[PDB]
Amino acid sequence: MGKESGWDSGRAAVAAVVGGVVAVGTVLVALSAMGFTSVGIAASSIAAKMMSTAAIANGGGVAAGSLVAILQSVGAAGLSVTSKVIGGFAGTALGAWLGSPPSS
């Protein structure tokens, strides 16, 4: 299945997804709570329970909502600024900060 897609992994994957739980929190609260509205609102949707949560475009579940656009952007962009801050391009990564120092 597939041919080495960004580190071939199945279960462990989740693990790799864990690394940075906090980051996942801020990212979430960030997306979800894109503003000062989420509490009461969340209480509303919750109170509703089973309403539709469907969009006339994809169908339902697995990507559903404008957030999608954010997924594509934040996806590439994010991963970008990410790895970027990490290494640069398949090489030199993971370390006590090691961007591009004055080396010769």
Swiss-Prot record:
Main location: membrane
Free-text function comment from the UniProt entry: Plays a role in the apoptotic process and has a pro-apoptotic activity.
Similarity comment: family membership: Belongs to the IFI6/IFI27 family.
Membrane-traversing stretches: 14-34, 59-79, 81-101
Listed GO MF terms: molecular adaptor activity
Keywords: Apoptosis, Membrane, Transmembrane, Transmembrane helix
Entries under Gene3D superfamilies matching the protein: 6.10.110.10
Subcellular location: Membrane
Gene name, Swiss-Prot/TrEMBL: IFI27L1
Protein's recorded name: Interferon alpha-inducible protein 27-like protein 1
Domain of life: Eukaryota
Membrane topology: Multi-pass membrane protein
Keyword Transmembrane helix: yes
GO biological process: apoptotic process; intrinsic apoptotic signaling pathway
Cellular component per GO, a single term: mitochondrial membrane
Pfam families: Ifi-6-16 (PF06140)
InterPro entries membership: IFI6/IFI27-like, IFI6/IFI27-like_sf
